[PDB]
Amino acid sequence: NISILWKEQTGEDLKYTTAIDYMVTRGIIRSDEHRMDSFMSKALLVQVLDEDEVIAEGEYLETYYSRAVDEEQEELLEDKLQVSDFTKIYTAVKQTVLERRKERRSADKKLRKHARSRE
RNA sequence: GUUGGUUCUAUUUCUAGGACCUGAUUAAUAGGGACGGUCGGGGGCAUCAGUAUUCAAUUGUC
Numbered sequence: 575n576i577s578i579l580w581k582e583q584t585g586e587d588l589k590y591t592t593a594i595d596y597m598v599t600r601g602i603i604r605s606d607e608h609r610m611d612s613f614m615s616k617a618l619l620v621q622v623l624d625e626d627e628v629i630a631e632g633e634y635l636e637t638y639y640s641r642a643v644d645e646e647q648e649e650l651l652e653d654k655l656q657v658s659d660f661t662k663i664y665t666a667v668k669q670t671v672l673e674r675r676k677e678r679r680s681a682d683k684k685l686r687k688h689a690r691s692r693e
Numbered sequence: 694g695u696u697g698g699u700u701c702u703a704u705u706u707c708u709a710g711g712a713c714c715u716g717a718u719u720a721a722u723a724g725g726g727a728c729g730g731u732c733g734g735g736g737g738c739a740u741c742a743g744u745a746u747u748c749a750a751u752u753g754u755c
Contacts, residue, residue: 669701685698688708
């Protein structure tokens with residue numbers, strides 16, 4: 575119903591607010607809500623530039639369903655593929671920024687305590 | 694059922710996946726073993742005691 579109201583709807587500002595809310599969303603219920611909001615969002619990419627910031631990041635039966643959701647978001651385009659490649663480079667840049675923060679900070683045994691406590 | 698490295702996280706918190714750095718019935722009014730308080734002219738060594746016996750000394754009496 576809220577996606578129906580968002581399609582019925584500061585138009586571009588509220589659309590960016592909805593895309594920011596979907597990125598803040600993206601446990602199984604919230605992940606299904608994120609896939610539903612991405613399906614309600616999918617111009618084809620000129621409004622969806624600021625909406626694939628997390629749906630491509632996800633591209634454990636809930637994890638298998640999330641992988642099916644990522645395949646659904648990838649199937650459902652030249653400008654969209656260009657924005658997706660730029661967003662992949664931006665996620666690589668964010669990984670570089672997090673790695674730079676970690677390398678400047680350097681949980682030595684705590685970096686393996688999670689795996690030693692999991693198995 | 695003991696190390697190092699990868700990526701994902703929003704208001705440094707706090708996070709997800711690799712490698713690599715010891716086997717399986719019951720517990721007999723069968724058994725041996727441990728433990729507890731014991732028990733016995735049981736044994737070995739060391740020690741203590743007894744009054745006899747023998748010997749010696751000192752006497753006493755015939």
